[PDB]
Amino acid sequence: QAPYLSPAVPFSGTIQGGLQDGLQITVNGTVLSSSGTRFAVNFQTGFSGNDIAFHFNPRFEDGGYVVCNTRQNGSWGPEERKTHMPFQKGMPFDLCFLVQSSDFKVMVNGILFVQYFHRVPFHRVDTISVNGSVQLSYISF
Ligand SMILES: CC(=O)N[C@H]1[C@@H](O[C@H]2[C@@H](O)[C@@H](CO)O[C@@H](O[C@@H]3[C@@H](O)[C@H](O)O[C@H](CO)[C@@H]3O)[C@@H]2NC(C)=O)O[C@H](CO)[C@H](O)[C@@H]1O
Secondary structure, three states: OOOEEOOOOOEEEEOOOOOOOOOEEEEEEEEOOOOOOEEEEEEEOOOOOOOEEEEEEEEOOOOOEEEEEEEEOOEEOOOEEEOOOOOOOOOEEEEEEEEOOOEEEEEEOOEEEEEEEOOOOHHHOOEEEEEEOEEEEEEEO
């Protein structure tokens, strides 16, 4: 699939073919300095953000941590929290999501950061959405 170049945030874009085992999705952008304390990348079903298979949610709060969660029919599940922050306000990042049979493997600037075990079927995902305190250079596949 051709990349999305400099899309405005908040952004929502189709993942052509849906999520597939071995698919790699890169989000390349910059964390904003004066526009809040959180962003998220959502792997979701269509345009209701009510069904989000994987919400990846860095928070520049409390020393910095990342929330990983799933939303179903509007309701957020129990969070998994990673109490390390690999991003920095005002710095560019390369964020890579690799779909695997049982989990997502998430890399930041080339280094494995977290794995998120599938809670819902990943083949149901057809949309990536990004919002909060970031600007995007590209999303690629
Ligand atoms: C960045 C983003 O996508 N924000 C939208 C999203 O925000 C939710 C979501 O990140 C869930 C994930 O579990 O967490 C909510 O945060 C709360 C805390 O603020 C709360 O006080 O503690 C809770 C744990 O006990 C939880 O972590 C977060 N909500 C808010 C208000 O920030 O979804 C929202 C709608 O639910 C809204 O769309 C945000 O914009």
